[PDB]
Structure formats: structure tokens, C-alpha cells
């Protein structure tokens, strides 16, 4: 890998600089290099990894949706034939997106998850695994679509099981996992009732545990609780 010659600490330093510069592709490449050093990631480093790839794939997903909408409109009755270009370019973006997802999934499988023994790290990585299978599912149309969906579900479910046993209901990783798994249910699994039930129960159980928190922990937990409420408002 192109980052093989760079010190771990320098890759992390540069990831932080890339974030400040809003250079998320560079940030992701630096963090990939850091992961590939083979040492476990600290909490801060896990967050750098996730922020980098979230921003890269987020941009690809937004572009894919624009292109998919244009393509769908082209296939409506009365739309003039404009040739293969819209499909080709949507495919191009799609393939690049799938590549990024495969890269992230590859880092998780080799070997972040297997070395992650603490609840906070293991849940964080399993949530990421669910998220990147969910992004693959968003664009899947073939023989493997059901298996991709099930891979996301399985990763999220393992993360939920650990989170419920090992973390308080206000833990931001637990909350963010539940938020995202709820979206999986609504948008991917055609299970809006499950999505709504999960968001509601997660919100209410967090509410009941806020009294245990410092002001700073309260801020962190309530931010994500508000996202749960925002989704519930969208869905009800």
C-alpha cells in the first residue's frame, strides 16, 4: 500500500489535517494506512476512520441518487431516448461506491473486528459493518441482494446484542447503532413498524438514564436522541 512507508503517528496526524482541510478522500487513505499497520485503534482513531469514510461514501451516495433519479425519469413513457450514457455514468459511480464499501468491509474483516474485545470497540466496528453492507444494499439489484441485506442485519444484530448487555442506554455508540439499525429497518428491510418501535424504545430508555450523566455526557446523548425523535417525526 502507498502508505506503507509512512509512520502510524504521521498518518494519524495527516488524517487530522485532511479533516481540517475537508480533504476526506485523503483522510480516508491516511486512516486506511493507519489501520493496515496492524495495531488496534483508539477511540479517537476509530472516529477518524469513520468520519473519513462516512464523508467519502456520503458524497458517492448523494451522487448515485441524483443519477438514479435521472435514469428513472429516462425510463418513463414519453421520455426521449438519450442512449446508454446515464446508465453508464450511474454504473461508474455505483462501482466506485461499491469499491469504497468493500475497502471498509475489508479493513473490518482484516482484522479490526476480530481483535476488538471491549464492548465500545466491537460495537463500533460491527455498527460500521452493518452501515457499509446497508450502503451496498441501497444499490443492489442482483442474485445477492437478499444476502447483502442479511449481512447488514446480522452485523447490526450482533452489535445490538453486545450493546444491550454491556453499555448503558445513553451510550452514544449504542444510540447511534440503534438510530442506524432503525433506518435499516425503514429503508432497506421494508419494516417501518420495526424501525419506529426501535427508535421509540431506544429514545425512551435513554431518557430514563439521562439523570446519571454529567453535563458533557448529557450533551452527547441528547444530540443523538434528537436524531431519533427527528426520524420518528418523519415517519409518524
Amino acid at each position: 500500500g502507498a502508505m506503507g512507508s509512512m509512520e502510524r503517528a504521521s498518518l494519524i496526524q495527516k488524517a487530522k489535517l485532511a479533516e481540517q482541510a475537508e480533504r476526506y478522500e485523503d483522510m480516508a487513505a491516511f486512516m486506511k494506512g493507519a489501520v493496515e499497520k496492524g495495531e488496534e485503534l483508539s477511540c479517537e482513531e476509530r472516529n477518524l476512520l469513520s468520519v473519513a469514510y462516512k464523508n467519502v461514501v456520503g458524497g458517492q451516495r448523494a451522487a448515485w441518487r441524483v443519477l438514479s433519479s435521472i435514469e428513472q425519469k429516462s425510463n418513463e413513457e414519453g421520455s426521449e431516448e438519450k442512449g446508454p450514457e446515464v446508465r453508464e455514468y450511474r454504473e461508474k459511480v455505483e462501482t466506485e461506491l461499491q469499491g469504497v464499501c468493500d475497502t471498509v468491509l475489508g479493513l473490518l474483516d482484516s482484522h479490526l473486528i476480530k481483535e476488538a474485545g471491549d464492548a465500545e470497540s466491537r460495537v463500533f466496528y460491527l455498527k460500521m459493518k452493518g452501515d457499509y453492507y446497508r450502503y451496498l444494499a441501497e444499490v443492489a439489484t442482483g442474485d445477492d441482494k437478499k444476502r447483502i441485506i442479511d449481512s447488514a442485519r446480522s452485523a447490526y444484530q450482533e452489535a445490538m446484542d453486545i450493546s444491550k448487555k454491556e453499555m448503558p442506554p445513553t451510550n452514544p455508540i449504542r444510540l447511534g447503532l440503534a438510530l442506524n439499525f432503525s433506518v435499516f429497518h425503514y429503508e432497506i428491510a421494508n419494516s417501518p413498524e420495526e424501525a419506529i418501535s426501535l427508535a421509540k424504545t431506544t429514545f425512551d430508555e435513554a431518557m430514563a438514564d439521562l439523570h446519571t450523566l454529567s453535563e458533557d455526557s448529557y450533551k452527547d446523548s441528547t444530540l443523538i436522541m434528537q436524531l431519533l425523535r427527528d426520524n420518528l417525526t418523519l415517519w409518524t
Binding site: 452501515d131 447511534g176 438510530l179 442506524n180 433506518v183 425503514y186 429503508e187 443523538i224 436524531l227 427527528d230 426520524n231 418523519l234 415517519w235
Partner: peptide, 5 residues
């Protein structure tokens, strides 16, 4: 589009 983190 719904919120995720």
C-alpha cells in the same frame, strides 16, 4: 432522507 450517524 432520515438521520444516521
Amino acid at each position: 432522507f432520515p438521520a444516521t450517524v
